């Protein structure tokens, strides 16, 4: 049976296309707004912080870059990372994922139902959430497990902390050896014939082969990379924006995996942080509009005087 290909908009009439869009749109708002009570829907028990514990990261969207100045007069560049829709999806037991730490699954920003696989749509239907764009796996200890379906916000990170960033870098396509690896080129005018950017000799005569580690032209850029030791300067509450020092890998409007830094110096720097995550309902208090690091010159602060 050579069944023809179909899409959601094929058989829909002009009087029902606006209706179906309204139908799915109203479902998303009802589902998202019904998850805003993590501590009122029988959450899993919360344990006190312990040494060597790891928290849960987020999935955020990279907006752009801004300049930022400190109280000593130095200038720093911060990248605006916005958390749009972050929900923990599924929890994997310790003995079924790695044998040392449990795994928590976190989704990305909301996408349309009409362009996802049947299994993917069915999986979210049971949980009751709209489909996500990117899904990542986080390694979390057993003392910091979160019930799936619990929303996460940018307040999960407090200013002053050092965080990592993992995302796909900018893909530059099939680039030559000079751009990919940085080999020097041949001279341009001293008689050189049809050789200005070629790698040159690639091996030795005796071996009569090319070693597996040899550098050759090929794909460049579209791979997963991680940046370590990025300090968090400012946290925005209402818009859920995180400011990270330096440059994070990935192009604009991409999805970025954020986690606590794993560097040896930045160990156990979570006692003074929310655990296992920031629950806005439990505090019953309104956080400040913006959270500033102690060294950041605020926009509504008097001008710097070196007296």
Partner 1 sequence: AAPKNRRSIEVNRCRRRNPQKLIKVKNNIDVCPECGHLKQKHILCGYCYEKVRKETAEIRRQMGKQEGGPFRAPTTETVVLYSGETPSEQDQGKRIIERERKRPSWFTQN
Partner 2 sequence: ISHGRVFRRLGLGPESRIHLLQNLLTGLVRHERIEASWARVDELRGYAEKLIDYGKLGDTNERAMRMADFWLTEKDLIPKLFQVLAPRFQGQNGGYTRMLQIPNRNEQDRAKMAVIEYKGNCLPPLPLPRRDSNLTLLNQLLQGLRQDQEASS
Partner 3 sequence: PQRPETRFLSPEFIPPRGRTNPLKFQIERKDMLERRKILHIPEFYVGSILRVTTADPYASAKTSQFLGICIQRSGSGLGATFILRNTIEGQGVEICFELYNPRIQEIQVVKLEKRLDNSLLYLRDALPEYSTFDVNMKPITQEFNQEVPVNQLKVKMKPKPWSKRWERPKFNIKGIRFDLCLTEEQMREAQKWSQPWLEFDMMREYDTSKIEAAIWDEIEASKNS
Partner RNA sequence: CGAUGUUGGAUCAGGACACCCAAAUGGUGCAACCGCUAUUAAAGGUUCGUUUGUUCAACGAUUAAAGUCCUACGUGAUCUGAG
Q: Cite the annotated binding site for Mg(2+) by residue number.
A: 171, 196
288 lies in the site for partner 1, by CB under 8 A: no
Binding partner selected for residue 118 from partner 1, partner 3, Mg ion, none, CB under the kind-specific 5 to 8 Å limit: none
4 lies in the site for partner 2, by CB under 8 A: no
12 lies in the site for partner 2, by CB under 8 A: yes
Kindly state the smallest distance separating residue 175's Cβ from partner 1, in Å: 25
- Going from the C-alpha of 82 to that of each of 101, 162, 228, 244, the distances in angstroms are 28, 17, 19, 11
Kindly state the smallest distance separating residue 280's Cβ from partner 3, in Å: 21
Q: Which is nearer to partner 3, 53 or 82 (CB)?
A: 82
190 lies in the site for RNA, by CB under 7 A: yes
User: For RNA, what does the binding mask look like between residues 214 and 243, x meaning CB under 7 A?
Assistant: -x----------------------------
126, two tokens: 């049971």
Binding residues: 171, 196
Q: Which of 84, 186, 219, 272 binds RNA (CB under 7 A)?
A: 186
Considering only residues 6 through 25, tell me which ones interact with partner 1, judged by CB under 8 A.
10
d(CA 68, CA 162): 17
For the chain, how far is it from start to end, CA to CA, in angstroms?
A: 85
Q: Which of 154, 201, 143 is CA-nearest to residue 59? A: 154
d(CA 20, CA 8): 10
Q: How far is CA 73 from the centre of its chain?
A: 31
Q: Cβ distance 72 to 110 under 8 Å?
A: no
Considering only residues 36 through 75, tell me which ones interact with RNA, judged by CB under 7 A.
none
Contact region for partner 2 (CB under 8 A) — 8-16, 110-118, 241-249, 277-285?
8-16
Q: Cβ distance 140 to 101 under 8 Å?
A: yes
d(CA 20, CA 117): 19
178 lies in the site for partner 3, by CB under 8 A: no
Cis peptide leading into residue 71 (ω within 30°)? no
Q: Which is nearer to partner 2, 12 or 120 (CB)?
A: 12
H helices of 34-187, where?
Answer: 94-97, 118-127, 177-181
Q: Which is nearer to partner 1, 7 or 306 (CB)?
A: 7
CB atoms inside a 10 Å sphere around CB 280: 17
5 lies in the site for partner 1, by CB under 8 A: yes
d(CA 176, CA 184): 12
30 lies in the site for partner 2, by CB under 8 A: no
Residue that is written with structure tokens 């949980």 in the block = 127
63 lies in the site for partner 3, by CB under 8 A: yes
d(CA 81, CA 243): 6
4 lies in the site for partner 1, by CB under 8 A: yes
Contact region for partner 2 (CB under 8 A) — 19-27, 65-73, 74-82, 255-263?
19-27
Which residue ranges make up the site for partner 1 (CB under 8 A)?
A: 2-5, 10
Which residue ranges make up the site for RNA (CB under 7 A)?
A: 183-187, 190-195, 198-207, 211, 215
């Amino acid at each position: 049976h050579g069944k023809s290909v179909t899409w959601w908009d094929e058989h829909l009439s002009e009087e029902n296309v606006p209706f179906v869009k309204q139908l799915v749109s109203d479902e998303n708002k009802a589902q998202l707004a019904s998850k805003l009570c993590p501590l009122k829907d029988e959450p899993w028990p919360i344990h006190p912080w312990e040494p060597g514990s790891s928290r849960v990261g987020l999935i955020a969207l990279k907006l752009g870059m801004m300049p930022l100045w400190t109280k000593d007069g130095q200038k720093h560049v911060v990248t605006l990372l916005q958390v749009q829709d972050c929900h923990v999806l599924k929890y994997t037991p310790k003995e079924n994922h790695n044998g040392r730490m449990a795994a928590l699954t976190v989704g990305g920003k909301t996408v349309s139902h009409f362009h996802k696989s049947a299994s993917i749509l069915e999986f979210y239907q049971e949980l009751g959430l709209p489909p996500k764009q990117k899904v990542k796996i986080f390694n979390v200890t057993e003392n910091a497990v979160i019930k799936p379906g619990t929303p996460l916000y940018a307040a999960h990170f407090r200013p002053g902390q050092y965080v990592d960033v993992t995302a796909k870098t900018i893909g530059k396509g099939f680039q030559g050896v000079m751009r990919r690896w940085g080999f020097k080129g041949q001279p341009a005018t001293h008689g050189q014939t049809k050789t200005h950017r070629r790698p040159g000799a690639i091996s030795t005569g005796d071996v009569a082969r090319v070693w597996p580690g040899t550098k050759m032209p090929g794909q460049l850029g579209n791979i997963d990379r991680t940046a370590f030791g990025l300090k968090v300067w400012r946290i925005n509450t209402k818009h859920n924006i995180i400011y990270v020092n330096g440059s994070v890998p990935g192009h604009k409007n991409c999805l970025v995996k954020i986690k606590d830094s794993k560097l040896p110096a930045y160990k156990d720097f979570c006692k003074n942080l929310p655990f296992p995550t920031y629950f806005p309902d439990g505090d019953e208090e309104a956080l400040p509009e913006d959270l500033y690091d102690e060294n950041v010159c605020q926009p509504g602060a008097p001008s710097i005087t070196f007296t």
